[PDB]
């Protein structure tokens, strides 16, 4: 046993090994649209993924990560609330056992079926390990998934999932274009927060897109066939791998749009 999402080891238990769980800038949060302040000084986000180099997909026992080559300034996030250049290192999702739950952020207490996190690190810190120890070390771009029409750009991910069913399995995953996971609009909300899994470090500038993407029920079903457990262990379906909303405390969520 370590941390997870079960009754015995789930989010309510995390603070015992990670006391920052009750800290002042924990994520996710509910985004109250009537209270987020429009900030006309925010810049447009700049998402430069044309030279992205995906490498590998890995089931890590809590989600699956699609990992990228981050040894140079290939796929980067710049602009919006950010200073400097943040390199994409990996993306992953959180999702539910049912379509009415699964996202980590909520919008006016509305839950989406899933949430995509594109994780980037601030190049001024040299490496990802150094970046997570800094209050401005990461930028995570969060995108909500609603169940509807299929997302064609997601299908290459859903088709490889059978090959990484269990914890610690990985597969080569090259030539994957993460632009195919973006919505039309880059309007966003932003706030200072944390990693949403242990060690829950308070190193993240959250940029959460307003426009969800649509995925089909067949595609999200495939997420829910993954397993938390390793090969040969008792089957535990990888579902409901989301942390509930944490109190906002002394923070302000800004909107990029009016
Ligand atoms: N869900 S999330 O907020 O996007 C999120 C993104 C990245 C990480 C992450 O790198 N954990 C690994 C780690 F922090 F455990 C390490 F110290 F970095 F090894 C966790 C949560
Ligand atoms: Zn995440």
PDB file of C-alpha atoms in Angstrom, residues 43-213:
ATOM      1  CA  UNK A  43      -2.379  37.867 -22.725  1.00  0.00           C
ATOM      2  CA  UNK A  44      -3.499  35.257 -25.222  1.00  0.00           C
ATOM      3  CA  UNK A  45      -2.031  31.831 -24.419  1.00  0.00           C
ATOM      4  CA  UNK A  46       0.583  30.696 -26.886  1.00  0.00           C
ATOM      5  CA  UNK A  47       0.491  26.892 -27.421  1.00  0.00           C
ATOM      6  CA  UNK A  48       3.357  25.840 -29.699  1.00  0.00           C
ATOM      7  CA  UNK A  49       3.068  22.110 -30.196  1.00  0.00           C
ATOM      8  CA  UNK A  50       4.057  21.851 -33.858  1.00  0.00           C
ATOM      9  CA  UNK A  51       7.456  20.319 -32.979  1.00  0.00           C
ATOM     10  CA  UNK A  52       6.124  18.050 -30.221  1.00  0.00           C
ATOM     11  CA  UNK A  53       7.902  14.690 -29.941  1.00  0.00           C
ATOM     12  CA  UNK A  54       5.843  12.060 -28.073  1.00  0.00           C
ATOM     13  CA  UNK A  55       7.797   9.015 -26.949  1.00  0.00           C
ATOM     14  CA  UNK A  56       5.891   6.603 -24.816  1.00  0.00           C
ATOM     15  CA  UNK A  57       2.646   5.903 -22.959  1.00  0.00           C
ATOM     16  CA  UNK A  58       2.785   4.471 -19.408  1.00  0.00           C
ATOM     17  CA  UNK A  59       0.199   3.136 -16.981  1.00  0.00           C
ATOM     18  CA  UNK A  60       1.593   4.360 -13.620  1.00  0.00           C
ATOM     19  CA  UNK A  61      -1.133   2.821 -11.467  1.00  0.00           C
ATOM     20  CA  UNK A  62      -3.034   6.079 -11.026  1.00  0.00           C
ATOM     21  CA  UNK A  63      -3.500   7.251 -14.606  1.00  0.00           C
ATOM     22  CA  UNK A  64      -1.738   6.819 -17.930  1.00  0.00           C
ATOM     23  CA  UNK A  65       0.891   9.380 -19.041  1.00  0.00           C
ATOM     24  CA  UNK A  66       1.798  10.172 -22.618  1.00  0.00           C
ATOM     25  CA  UNK A  67       5.405  11.358 -22.280  1.00  0.00           C
ATOM     26  CA  UNK A  68       7.347  13.787 -24.548  1.00  0.00           C
ATOM     27  CA  UNK A  69      10.919  14.600 -25.330  1.00  0.00           C
ATOM     28  CA  UNK A  70      11.541  17.751 -23.120  1.00  0.00           C
ATOM     29  CA  UNK A  71      15.382  17.930 -23.555  1.00  0.00           C
ATOM     30  CA  UNK A  72      14.823  21.006 -25.850  1.00  0.00           C
ATOM     31  CA  UNK A  73      12.203  23.828 -26.481  1.00  0.00           C
ATOM     32  CA  UNK A  74      10.063  21.730 -28.852  1.00  0.00           C
ATOM     33  CA  UNK A  75       6.475  21.711 -27.491  1.00  0.00           C
ATOM     34  CA  UNK A  76       6.061  24.836 -25.325  1.00  0.00           C
ATOM     35  CA  UNK A  77       3.402  26.881 -23.553  1.00  0.00           C
ATOM     36  CA  UNK A  78       4.077  30.699 -23.265  1.00  0.00           C
ATOM     37  CA  UNK A  79       2.030  33.869 -22.748  1.00  0.00           C
ATOM     38  CA  UNK A  80      -1.235  34.179 -20.855  1.00  0.00           C
ATOM     39  CA  UNK A  81      -0.337  34.532 -17.116  1.00  0.00           C
ATOM     40  CA  UNK A  82       3.111  32.993 -17.634  1.00  0.00           C
ATOM     41  CA  UNK A  83       6.576  34.480 -17.630  1.00  0.00           C
ATOM     42  CA  UNK A  84       8.975  32.594 -19.760  1.00  0.00           C
ATOM     43  CA  UNK A  85       8.774  29.285 -21.553  1.00  0.00           C
ATOM     44  CA  UNK A  86       7.320  26.068 -20.189  1.00  0.00           C
ATOM     45  CA  UNK A  87       8.101  22.778 -21.903  1.00  0.00           C
ATOM     46  CA  UNK A  88       5.520  20.040 -22.291  1.00  0.00           C
ATOM     47  CA  UNK A  89       6.674  16.865 -20.454  1.00  0.00           C
ATOM     48  CA  UNK A  90       3.527  14.733 -20.299  1.00  0.00           C
ATOM     49  CA  UNK A  91      -0.230  14.622 -20.457  1.00  0.00           C
ATOM     50  CA  UNK A  92      -2.710  12.447 -18.647  1.00  0.00           C
ATOM     51  CA  UNK A  93      -6.400  12.396 -17.751  1.00  0.00           C
ATOM     52  CA  UNK A  94      -8.683  11.988 -14.733  1.00  0.00           C
ATOM     53  CA  UNK A  95     -12.083  10.382 -15.230  1.00  0.00           C
ATOM     54  CA  UNK A  96     -15.095   8.906 -13.532  1.00  0.00           C
ATOM     55  CA  UNK A  97     -16.944   5.660 -13.209  1.00  0.00           C
ATOM     56  CA  UNK A  98     -20.011   7.466 -14.679  1.00  0.00           C
ATOM     57  CA  UNK A  99     -20.357  10.341 -17.156  1.00  0.00           C
ATOM     58  CA  UNK A 100     -21.565  12.798 -14.418  1.00  0.00           C
ATOM     59  CA  UNK A 101     -18.291  12.740 -12.549  1.00  0.00           C
ATOM     60  CA  UNK A 102     -14.573  12.559 -13.377  1.00  0.00           C
ATOM     61  CA  UNK A 103     -13.164  16.090 -13.719  1.00  0.00           C
ATOM     62  CA  UNK A 104     -11.054  17.531 -10.932  1.00  0.00           C
ATOM     63  CA  UNK A 105     -11.943  21.217 -11.490  1.00  0.00           C
ATOM     64  CA  UNK A 106     -15.675  21.971 -11.538  1.00  0.00           C
ATOM     65  CA  UNK A 107     -17.369  24.989 -13.102  1.00  0.00           C
ATOM     66  CA  UNK A 108     -20.217  26.380 -10.924  1.00  0.00           C
ATOM     67  CA  UNK A 109     -20.132  22.980  -9.160  1.00  0.00           C
ATOM     68  CA  UNK A 110     -20.686  21.245 -12.611  1.00  0.00           C
ATOM     69  CA  UNK A 111     -18.562  18.102 -13.077  1.00  0.00           C
ATOM     70  CA  UNK A 112     -17.375  16.911 -16.430  1.00  0.00           C
ATOM     71  CA  UNK A 113     -16.833  13.298 -17.417  1.00  0.00           C
ATOM     72  CA  UNK A 114     -13.039  13.715 -17.547  1.00  0.00           C
ATOM     73  CA  UNK A 115     -10.271  16.270 -17.476  1.00  0.00           C
ATOM     74  CA  UNK A 116      -7.036  16.366 -19.536  1.00  0.00           C
ATOM     75  CA  UNK A 117      -3.876  17.852 -17.915  1.00  0.00           C
ATOM     76  CA  UNK A 118      -1.095  18.910 -20.207  1.00  0.00           C
ATOM     77  CA  UNK A 119       1.878  19.322 -17.881  1.00  0.00           C
ATOM     78  CA  UNK A 120       4.678  21.806 -18.596  1.00  0.00           C
ATOM     79  CA  UNK A 121       7.767  22.964 -16.658  1.00  0.00           C
ATOM     80  CA  UNK A 122       9.561  26.341 -16.460  1.00  0.00           C
ATOM     81  CA  UNK A 123      12.795  26.065 -18.415  1.00  0.00           C
ATOM     82  CA  UNK A 124      14.458  28.691 -16.053  1.00  0.00           C
ATOM     83  CA  UNK A 125      14.771  25.810 -13.569  1.00  0.00           C
ATOM     84  CA  UNK A 126      16.838  23.433 -15.753  1.00  0.00           C
ATOM     85  CA  UNK A 127      14.971  20.176 -15.086  1.00  0.00           C
ATOM     86  CA  UNK A 128      11.495  19.076 -14.018  1.00  0.00           C
ATOM     87  CA  UNK A 129      12.686  17.902 -10.599  1.00  0.00           C
ATOM     88  CA  UNK A 130      13.971  21.367  -9.774  1.00  0.00           C
ATOM     89  CA  UNK A 131      10.845  23.016 -11.249  1.00  0.00           C
ATOM     90  CA  UNK A 132       8.345  21.224  -8.926  1.00  0.00           C
ATOM     91  CA  UNK A 133      10.159  22.764  -5.903  1.00  0.00           C
ATOM     92  CA  UNK A 134       9.312  26.305  -7.069  1.00  0.00           C
ATOM     93  CA  UNK A 135       6.035  28.260  -6.769  1.00  0.00           C
ATOM     94  CA  UNK A 136       6.202  29.106 -10.471  1.00  0.00           C
ATOM     95  CA  UNK A 137       7.725  25.801 -11.614  1.00  0.00           C
ATOM     96  CA  UNK A 138       4.842  24.229 -13.550  1.00  0.00           C
ATOM     97  CA  UNK A 139       2.016  25.296 -15.810  1.00  0.00           C
ATOM     98  CA  UNK A 140      -0.723  22.749 -16.327  1.00  0.00           C
ATOM     99  CA  UNK A 141      -3.247  23.293 -19.101  1.00  0.00           C
ATOM    100  CA  UNK A 142      -6.547  21.665 -18.045  1.00  0.00           C
ATOM    101  CA  UNK A 143      -9.220  20.782 -20.632  1.00  0.00           C
ATOM    102  CA  UNK A 144     -12.658  19.348 -19.742  1.00  0.00           C
ATOM    103  CA  UNK A 145     -14.114  16.367 -21.634  1.00  0.00           C
ATOM    104  CA  UNK A 146     -17.828  16.023 -22.139  1.00  0.00           C
ATOM    105  CA  UNK A 147     -19.473  12.893 -23.608  1.00  0.00           C
ATOM    106  CA  UNK A 148     -20.868  13.478 -27.103  1.00  0.00           C
ATOM    107  CA  UNK A 149     -19.347  13.100 -30.564  1.00  0.00           C
ATOM    108  CA  UNK A 150     -15.987  11.318 -30.848  1.00  0.00           C
ATOM    109  CA  UNK A 151     -12.702  13.231 -30.701  1.00  0.00           C
ATOM    110  CA  UNK A 152     -10.741  11.940 -33.660  1.00  0.00           C
ATOM    111  CA  UNK A 153      -7.452  13.173 -32.235  1.00  0.00           C
ATOM    112  CA  UNK A 154      -8.050  11.028 -29.115  1.00  0.00           C
ATOM    113  CA  UNK A 155      -8.540   7.769 -30.999  1.00  0.00           C
ATOM    114  CA  UNK A 156      -4.771   6.988 -31.254  1.00  0.00           C
ATOM    115  CA  UNK A 157      -4.603   7.138 -27.440  1.00  0.00           C
ATOM    116  CA  UNK A 158      -7.780   4.975 -26.904  1.00  0.00           C
ATOM    117  CA  UNK A 159      -6.429   2.277 -29.274  1.00  0.00           C
ATOM    118  CA  UNK A 160      -3.163   1.744 -27.429  1.00  0.00           C
ATOM    119  CA  UNK A 161      -4.810   1.395 -23.981  1.00  0.00           C
ATOM    120  CA  UNK A 162      -5.274  -2.405 -24.351  1.00  0.00           C
ATOM    121  CA  UNK A 163      -1.461  -2.623 -24.451  1.00  0.00           C
ATOM    122  CA  UNK A 164      -0.928  -0.861 -21.083  1.00  0.00           C
ATOM    123  CA  UNK A 165      -3.870  -2.373 -19.118  1.00  0.00           C
ATOM    124  CA  UNK A 166      -2.008  -2.742 -15.881  1.00  0.00           C
ATOM    125  CA  UNK A 167       0.302  -0.768 -13.574  1.00  0.00           C
ATOM    126  CA  UNK A 168       3.940  -0.472 -14.839  1.00  0.00           C
ATOM    127  CA  UNK A 169       3.162  -1.423 -18.480  1.00  0.00           C
ATOM    128  CA  UNK A 170       4.327   0.970 -21.163  1.00  0.00           C
ATOM    129  CA  UNK A 171       4.302   1.161 -24.965  1.00  0.00           C
ATOM    130  CA  UNK A 172       6.131   3.119 -27.581  1.00  0.00           C
ATOM    131  CA  UNK A 173       3.930   6.106 -28.575  1.00  0.00           C
ATOM    132  CA  UNK A 174       5.696   8.204 -31.160  1.00  0.00           C
ATOM    133  CA  UNK A 175       4.377  10.782 -33.622  1.00  0.00           C
ATOM    134  CA  UNK A 176       1.351  11.673 -31.500  1.00  0.00           C
ATOM    135  CA  UNK A 177       0.149  15.259 -32.151  1.00  0.00           C
ATOM    136  CA  UNK A 178      -1.331  16.791 -28.969  1.00  0.00           C
ATOM    137  CA  UNK A 179      -2.874  19.675 -31.036  1.00  0.00           C
ATOM    138  CA  UNK A 180      -5.670  17.202 -31.815  1.00  0.00           C
ATOM    139  CA  UNK A 181      -6.751  17.358 -28.151  1.00  0.00           C
ATOM    140  CA  UNK A 182      -7.412  21.135 -28.131  1.00  0.00           C
ATOM    141  CA  UNK A 183     -10.824  22.835 -28.344  1.00  0.00           C
ATOM    142  CA  UNK A 184     -11.447  25.690 -30.856  1.00  0.00           C
ATOM    143  CA  UNK A 185     -11.207  28.481 -28.298  1.00  0.00           C
ATOM    144  CA  UNK A 186      -8.194  29.159 -25.983  1.00  0.00           C
ATOM    145  CA  UNK A 187     -10.178  31.267 -23.533  1.00  0.00           C
ATOM    146  CA  UNK A 188      -9.267  30.310 -20.032  1.00  0.00           C
ATOM    147  CA  UNK A 189      -9.385  30.757 -16.271  1.00  0.00           C
ATOM    148  CA  UNK A 190      -6.220  30.941 -14.233  1.00  0.00           C
ATOM    149  CA  UNK A 191      -5.131  30.616 -10.571  1.00  0.00           C
ATOM    150  CA  UNK A 192      -2.132  29.505  -8.501  1.00  0.00           C
ATOM    151  CA  UNK A 193      -2.502  25.954  -7.259  1.00  0.00           C
ATOM    152  CA  UNK A 194      -0.815  22.626  -6.740  1.00  0.00           C
ATOM    153  CA  UNK A 195      -0.292  19.166  -8.072  1.00  0.00           C
ATOM    154  CA  UNK A 196      -3.586  17.276  -7.636  1.00  0.00           C
ATOM    155  CA  UNK A 197      -1.825  14.014  -6.665  1.00  0.00           C
ATOM    156  CA  UNK A 198       0.791  13.374  -3.929  1.00  0.00           C
ATOM    157  CA  UNK A 199       3.159  14.995  -3.281  1.00  0.00           C
ATOM    158  CA  UNK A 200       0.643  17.824  -3.837  1.00  0.00           C
ATOM    159  CA  UNK A 201       3.392  20.409  -4.304  1.00  0.00           C
ATOM    160  CA  UNK A 202       2.256  24.006  -4.570  1.00  0.00           C
ATOM    161  CA  UNK A 203       4.171  24.699  -7.786  1.00  0.00           C
ATOM    162  CA  UNK A 204       1.476  25.027 -10.449  1.00  0.00           C
ATOM    163  CA  UNK A 205      -0.014  27.912 -12.444  1.00  0.00           C
ATOM    164  CA  UNK A 206      -3.399  26.420 -13.500  1.00  0.00           C
ATOM    165  CA  UNK A 207      -4.710  27.405 -16.885  1.00  0.00           C
ATOM    166  CA  UNK A 208      -8.149  25.787 -17.310  1.00  0.00           C
ATOM    167  CA  UNK A 209      -9.827  26.161 -20.715  1.00  0.00           C
ATOM    168  CA  UNK A 210     -13.437  27.306 -20.794  1.00  0.00           C
ATOM    169  CA  UNK A 211     -14.496  25.201 -23.871  1.00  0.00           C
ATOM    170  CA  UNK A 212     -14.628  21.451 -23.200  1.00  0.00           C
ATOM    171  CA  UNK A 213     -13.786  18.941 -25.884  1.00  0.00           C
TER     172      UNK A 213
END
